[PDB]
Design a protein around this ligand. Structure first.
Ligand SMILES: Cc1[nH]c(C(=O)Nc2nc3cc(O)c(C(=O)O)cc3s2)c(Cl)c1Cl
Length: 192
């Protein structure tokens, strides 16, 4: 717990070092790319077939995959869900995105259950919890970048995300990638 909080603090103290320039939009868009890269890893492993990337009307971004779902069982050493360990302990890792997010929402569908957890600046608000039943599997991460970290360029650029997602669809030809902008209704579907 003290180690977790110190590691998150290490990322916040030197955020450009972990995520890229925090003033010119590079780091901001790399936050999305890190989350997408985890979904792509789940596609490379043979589990994920579709990835949905949403720019919400409030300039948060979500990434949904249909992979296995991050494991949810208690990780013995930490006494918290494996998912929480992945989200909070230091491809820079999704924990960097969590550390640099004012808020992050995690929803996992796995082993017949839906699980949800909220973080603020990487601090879990409650233990991962069951919210219902599902026959689906996958992982959804929605994050609200911290305005204490990201300056000047704070709004996501549809075209920057679209170009990278098109590249990833070409390089992962089986994967379907959807991009949706809730700010204006724009959407794209990349599937080689
Ligand atoms: C959008 C997004 N998706 C992910 C993701 O699917 N990561 C996952 N990691 C693991 C690790 C595992 O050991 C297992 C298992 O053994 O079944 C399953 C998964 S799924 C992450 Cl992380 C993020 Cl971020």
């Amino acid at each position: 717990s003290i180690k977790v909080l110190k590691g998150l603090d290490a990322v916040r103290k030197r955020p450009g070092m972990y995520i890229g320039d925090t003033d010119d939009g590079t780091g901001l868009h790399h936050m999305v790319f890190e989350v997408v890269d985890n979904a792509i890893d789940e596609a490379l492993a043979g589990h994920c077939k579709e990835i949905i990337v949403t720019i919400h009307a409030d300039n948060s971004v979500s990434v949904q995959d249909d992979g296995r779902g991050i494991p949810t069982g208690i990780h013995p050493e930490e006494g918290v869900s494996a998912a929480e360990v992945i989200m909070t302990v230091l491809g820079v890792g999704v924990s960097v995105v969590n550390a640099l997010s004012q808020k992050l929402e995690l929803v996992i569908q796995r082993e017949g259950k839906i699980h949800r957890q909220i973080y603020e600046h990487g601090v879990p608000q409650a233990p991962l919890a069951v919210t219902g039943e599902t026959e689906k599997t996958g992982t959804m991460v929605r994050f609200w970048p911290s305005l204490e970290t990201f300056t000047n360029v704070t709004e996501f650029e549809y075209e920057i995300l679209a170009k990278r997602l098109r590249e990833l669809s070409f390089l992962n030809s089986g994967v379907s990638i959807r991009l949706r902008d809730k700010r204006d209704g724009k959407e794209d579907h990349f599937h080689y």
